[PDB]
Amino acid sequence: LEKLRSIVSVGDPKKKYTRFEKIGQGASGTVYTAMDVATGQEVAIKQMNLQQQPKKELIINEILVMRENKNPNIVNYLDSYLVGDELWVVMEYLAGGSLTDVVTETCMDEGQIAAVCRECLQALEFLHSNQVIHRNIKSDNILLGMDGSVKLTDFGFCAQITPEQSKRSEMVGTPYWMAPEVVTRKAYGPKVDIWSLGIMAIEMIEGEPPYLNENPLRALYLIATNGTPELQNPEKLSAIFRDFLNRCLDMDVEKRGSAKELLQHQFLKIAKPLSSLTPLIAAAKEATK
Template structure:
């Protein structure tokens, strides 16, 4: 496995770092708070069993590659990787304030807190976009805070790289509720897709959940391209509503850039110092001390890429399993680049089909005959995909087109 910043396999990470409490568990492994024994600084340690995560190795490589290329105070820092047996240790910056999604559990944010957080997210996006990178999964769960209120973007497992010759992407990735229409439709898109996701995130920070959260995610995939853009309703300022409206223009050409949004009236008028956000962290801790908890508590706290409901086997599209990007293995072992349509493996197999079957199997776990039938159907779809790579994407695209035409 090729990993940027990988240290010699002869170096034992357990001698360099001391694991402490487990602070997260996601689809890729466990995350621990730790100590760098050389500097005595606090770090986050993600430990992945590569034998168990064989299908996710490309996602892991992608995330590490993107993080290793980033140098910004608004992006979580990557310190290096170590391989011990089949276990990959990824050492990351520790962010003890938790995610914005964690903090929302204790109650909604006020507009100054939202503006302050959005400004820092915009700084991170402005940096990424200047480096020709697209995050592609902006949402509250992927915004982390330090204990002092610093805000940083996290989770780069589905991040994309634009080049001078390829200025658009066509891959179907992200999380449906936050996904831009052009991404769902698998048409060419660029960094403006992140701006749409930011608009959805702004509503999430205001309301506690994204628009259409009461709907089934498959329905949302059909709904977003067909319907008018979501709007921020309720007792919010005019400038805040205008900010979300600007982000949620269905025509990407008319969405502002991150740099332009940093000058938006809502940000300029309501933004405060990031230390103001420490009030949210204190509030969340008090909320926890009062005995509040939920099923996601074990998956919280500050590490860059763990999902909110990583323990859950059923389909939870707020924490969609990351799919492979950039380079994907063909069934004969050869690598194919993203953008090759002929013979390229389907992305929707992982983002749409597999979660649907996971949900169906969970629903019918007490009915062995139905479960076996579901497993057989899933197996046959995978066999068909192996024989004809890309057919699942074409099927899903056709279904979406038929639905939108009605």
């Protein structure tokens, strides 16, 4: 809390931003829409409430890692404020919503799946080069722009590796997206996010990650004992797509591809413009309406 107090900005956020309009809830807190009074840029603010914050060290890590690792494929952090018992986190606004709404309500073609994977891999190649392991890659941590921009968010679970203390060993993430080495409690590397991306590609195909009908503990045991998840209907996908997924979901960490390596895959060469994701966004919004 003392370290937290010395990260936040000076000044009234209520007097710096106006046109506040609630666009969601509510795990970590309320999400509002706003407009910068001086610039006119449209911003997205999350009101946290520190009483519902369990670890707290997480909130500082999220803020610090977002700050130090700015890239076109990472939701652009603006500023933070502590009004009174509440923590306000100001970011660029991505009105397109989350990938979750797209994967759960729409059927994505191979060219669109490829486009998202490419952008997601660009975010990962950036973080892994800066020795940052995201650890919670899943459709829910992908925000879309109205133009079709793909941006990575939620850095609360991330780990900073060093040539001295790398790999990592703590069972962190969301069960259904976790790599077998994470679940089994082995020392793991950045390639855990690659596995999480393969699961997110399965979401894009099937609408949900393997074992979602199960309870998280069962899923942990199913990822541990079964490994590489089998698809409902593999025959529906192309060979180059079937290959991209095998490289993402390989049990052998050394065999599993890096973001640098997967960015060169034949699959991403069939990727469509990001404007091809705008009819998906339009359908998701109509479906969840």
